Design a protein around this ligand. Structure first.
Ligand SMILES: C[C@H]1CNCCCN1c1nccc(-c2noc([C@@]3(C)CCCc4sc(N)c(C#N)c43)n2)n1
Ligand SMILES: Nc1nc2c(ncn2[C@@H]2O[C@H](COP(=O)(O)OP(=O)(O)O)[C@@H](O)[C@H]2O)c(=O)[nH]1
Ligand SMILES: [Mg+2]
Length: 168
């Protein structure tokens, strides 16, 4: 049977969660996607020669710590924690996203990748060393991406699948 991997993309509003998801789905950069739309999208891909089905939840909206939202997020098998390299606040939020993921999964071992998006921009405020060091602190991979140019997009999603495979 073809394995399906449920991946959830999280991070502050405006970091490029939708742009990254749509680059994976459409193979096209979408600079404008209603920031309120939270939805899921599937794609069949080959990852290391194995054809699998990805189901990508692109999160959006206000925080809500409720039984129903926790249940929806608990469906995720792996998470991309996305910040933008020109937005320090988005980077400072990362620990909170990781903490909430571990809380809903009730696990100290949740497949996760740190993603530094907007790598095409010159306006960097978060050094690559700081981001690599954050991923090292938490023992997770770090991928530099640009939804604009497609830099890192497969690397981010496919690495997360590799992390789910290691966990399962
Ligand atoms: C960084 C904080 C600090 N608070 C002030 C506003 C900014 N923040 C903020 N904003 C918007 C969203 C989130 C946020 N934090 O986790 C999450 C996710 C989706 C991640 C996956 C696991 C769970 S489980 C659950 N119920 C969630 C929810 N809602 C989440 N989303 N956090
Ligand atoms: N230059 C650049 N802009 C990006 C990139 N990804 C997203 N954007 C822009 O960042 C803003 C937020 O993107 P969006 O995908 O809506 O973020 P979301 O709120 O996390 O879903 C929009 O103005 C996008 O055009 C990227 O990699 N590079
Ligand atoms: Mg969005």
């Amino acid at each position: 049977g073809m394995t399906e991997y449920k991946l959830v993309v999280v991070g502050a509003g405006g970091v490029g969660k939708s742009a990254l998801t749509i680059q994976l789905i459409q193979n096209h950069f979408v600079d404008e996607y209603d920031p309120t739309i939270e939805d899921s999208y599937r794609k069949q891909v080959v990852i290391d020669g194995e054809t699998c089905l990805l189901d990508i939840l692109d999160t959006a909206g206000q925080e809500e710590y409720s039984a129903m939202r926790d249940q929806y997020m608990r469906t995720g098998e792996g998470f991309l924690c996305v910040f933008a390299i020109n937005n320090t606040k988005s980077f400072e939020d990362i620990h909170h996203y990781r903490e909430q993921i571990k809380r809903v999964k009730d696990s100290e071992d949740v497949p996760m990748v740190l993603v530094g998006n907007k790598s095409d921009l010159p306006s960097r405020t978060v050094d690559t060393k700081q981001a690599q060091d954050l991923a090292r602190s938490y023992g997770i991979p770090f991928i530099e991406t640009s939804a604009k140019t497609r830099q890192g997009v497969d690397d981010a999603f496919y690495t997360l699948v590799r992390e789910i495979r290691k966990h399962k």
